[PDB]
Amino acid sequence: MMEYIDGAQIALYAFWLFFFGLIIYLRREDKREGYPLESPQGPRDGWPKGAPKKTYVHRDHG
């Protein structure tokens, strides 16, 4: 059977794929304000491309 592969190594690479997926998600959220960037060469999005600006609705008292 597989000698070098073991369940703790499998679990750890599963976590790494999840974790890099999470960092990408968080960096998208970080770009909902202040983006796209201004630059002398024109607008810039960096990477990953940001999520859009988000509009909030407030509880109607009328």
Partner: protein, 273 residues
Amino acid sequence: AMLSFEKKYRVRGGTLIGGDLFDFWFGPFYVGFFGVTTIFFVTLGTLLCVWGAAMGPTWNLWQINIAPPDLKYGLGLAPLREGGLWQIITLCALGAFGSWALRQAEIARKLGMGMHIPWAYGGAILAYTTLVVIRPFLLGAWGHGFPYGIFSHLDWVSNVGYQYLHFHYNPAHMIAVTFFFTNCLALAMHGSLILSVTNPPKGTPTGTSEQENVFFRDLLGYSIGAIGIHRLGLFLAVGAAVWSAICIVISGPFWTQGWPEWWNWWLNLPIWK
């Protein structure tokens, strides 16, 4: 590149040393005089780390180990291959970490912010300086510092703990752990409350300060307030590092027995001796 609101803020002023000479940006990064000294110390220290890896047995990231000198060298600078290289890197680290804190102060001054962030980071520098400067100096040899290696420093932590037989019994360590655990709970709690008012279930109005105040009061039985939770988080996180610095500096310089037998004073209080 700049944030869509940024250009307005990029004024001169607020520097500490360099005047206008280094008062510029490089991409997103502010430079300033302590930017220059930061990159100097970062580059020198990193290349000496890579040299320590090159003369060591392997390039495996986890196994690289730049160790301090033997205790016989006392407070002298050892031969570089015998641990003097660790001593140079330690000076570079102190230069980098100090430069980073002073650079943050220039950035806060330029933005009209309070100095809270530099001083909070000072709590981490204090703990590092305790491990590699103050405790080794009080023990009388730089060789008491921890080795620079991703797992070899965990071997050092392990062996230092067992130098006192049962390090869990260290009373300052118990406090420091309690701060670390309470901080993580408080961070989960504050993070969840802000997100859950700003992201209510679909088809629900955006929440309010009053709602998070109501819920928080149900959780802890008192209302902390918006500034109070940030004071608490800063107190817990920085207090953890300060009590960490205390718990290691008392181990060796001041206490040298097992930590369990420190508790003998409690068993001998005269009301129940």
